[PDB]
Amino acid sequence: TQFNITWEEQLQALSKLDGLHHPHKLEDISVHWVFNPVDISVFVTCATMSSHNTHYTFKPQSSPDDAMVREYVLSRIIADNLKYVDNLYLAAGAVICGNDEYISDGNVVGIHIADGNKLILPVIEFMPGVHVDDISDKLIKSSSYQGIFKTDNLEEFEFLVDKKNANNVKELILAYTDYFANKLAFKDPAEPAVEMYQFIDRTEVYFSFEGCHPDVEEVLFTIKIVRYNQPLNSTAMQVFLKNPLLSHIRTVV
Amino acid sequence: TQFNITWEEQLQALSKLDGLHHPHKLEDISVHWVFNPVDISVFVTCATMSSHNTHYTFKPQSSPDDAMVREYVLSRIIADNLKYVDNLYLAAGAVICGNDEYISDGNVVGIHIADGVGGNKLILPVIEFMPGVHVDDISDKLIKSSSYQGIFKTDNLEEFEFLVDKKNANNVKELILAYTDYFANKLAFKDPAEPAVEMYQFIDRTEVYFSFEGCHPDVEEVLFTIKIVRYNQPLNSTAMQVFLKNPLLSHIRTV
Ligand SMILES: NC(=[NH2+])NCCC[C@H](N)C(=O)O
Ligand SMILES: [K+]
Ligand SMILES: [K+]
């Protein structure tokens, strides 16, 4: 470890978040980092005893040191535990429990399509520590075009996730929007970013948020919602979902 | 601890295999094991520096000890490296290169589905290599979960045309033959072991298991099974062929 982040340091940072009482398991983190002069980026590896090593890459705005990397890793841990804030956790739980076909990882909500282990089409992905502006270039390149998305409108969410889930999903976005605006407020209020991209086969909507936390420069969080072009309600979807091959798709590590 | 298997012991055992020249990377193994008296089984854990951990479960035929577990783990390593025997590796390559839709990943030859997460590949299996496994040890589970059993004849190419259609039938038949000849001629017992062929019919697929038992100087037995799956409709069929190109498949993920 170039340096260590104790679990107590993490818990003290997480304790400044409103409504957080059941964070993820926190262990001492051994942090390694290397600076790359060619592309001006820092590669960070975090190792704990229980979980497997996570890695990050960020672009430094001044010469890298341990203090900057420590602050960056904290911002990722803070963002990672927003999902466990009471009202945010409850808002996601209402989405998942409101649909027997929805099953959750913890970071991905997907439509259950087959049993293996389970097979899913992702529709909601939680992306802590990510903002859409940092990936918009590849999104513009790989998508057909960018569309518009009305932020607070129930009919938009009926389109995205159907009437069965529209209000729950809309409340999930609103819960994150309110939490960042009221509980992670900057002196100069940050506005949420909403960006919609159309692909050959799907619509993707990104909801990105910037939050103020005492111990870091910025807390980033993005929620991605996917709508596949064929309506999940009927037609080709029923032909596709009943094909028995799906229950024999194998995952090779 | 509880005992180690150095890479030299592994390489010495592997060097007795005819036609093996490019084995898998070999490292020292740290082996842990524990006996379970309720179901009379031994659970084994094997750890290396580069690609740990592997796990096994077997049923001991006498009171377990290190020497038995060491022999068992060696038999799994030997079976694992049969895939790299020249004529067996070549016979597998002929199946793989004989179909642009066939891809190989790990012990599975099949149809690519999705690229998943962090190096994972979602694949529809067609041929599965199963080193260290014999069908007689899973047949009870297979009989209960299947509709019925059939009789499969390895002499007949048309039955391989049923399994993997005509584009792959002869390459696949030669793959089975290569393993059949290798075990009979290169891993022979004094009392010859006959290969096991068992076909199982499910509602949605047919699975044919080709199992083999091999004699090796350092272990009681070498086991190897090849599983071939035919699904409800053949691969080159039209109504299927449009299914593997549905764009949804690339977005599939596993929990
Ligand atoms: N059912 C069995 N696997 N019996 C042991 C067979 C041993 C050896 N393969 C032989 O035939 O001589
Ligand atoms: K559910
Ligand atoms: K191929």
Residue numbers in the entry:
A (entry chain B): 2 to 117, 121 to 257
B (entry chain A): 2 to 256
How did the manuscript describe this experimental structure?
By performing a screen based on affinity purification and mass spectrometry, we observed that a previously uncharacterised phage protein specifically binds to two RNA binding sites within the CTH of RNase E, and by doing so efficiently inhibits the RNA binding and degradation activity of the degradosome assembly. We have determined the structure of this protein (termed Dip, ‘degradosome interacting protein’) by X-ray crystallography and show that it forms an open-clamp like homo-dimeric structure, and binding of Dip to RNA binding regions within RNase E is characterized functionally and structurally. As with the 756–775 binding site, 9S rRNA can be competitively displaced from the 583–636 fragment by Dip, and the addition of a 4-fold excess of Dip is able to completely remove the bound RNA from the RNase E fragment. These results demonstrate that Dip targets both RNA binding sites in the C-terminal half of the RNA degradosome, and consequently blocks the binding of RNA to the RNase E subunit.
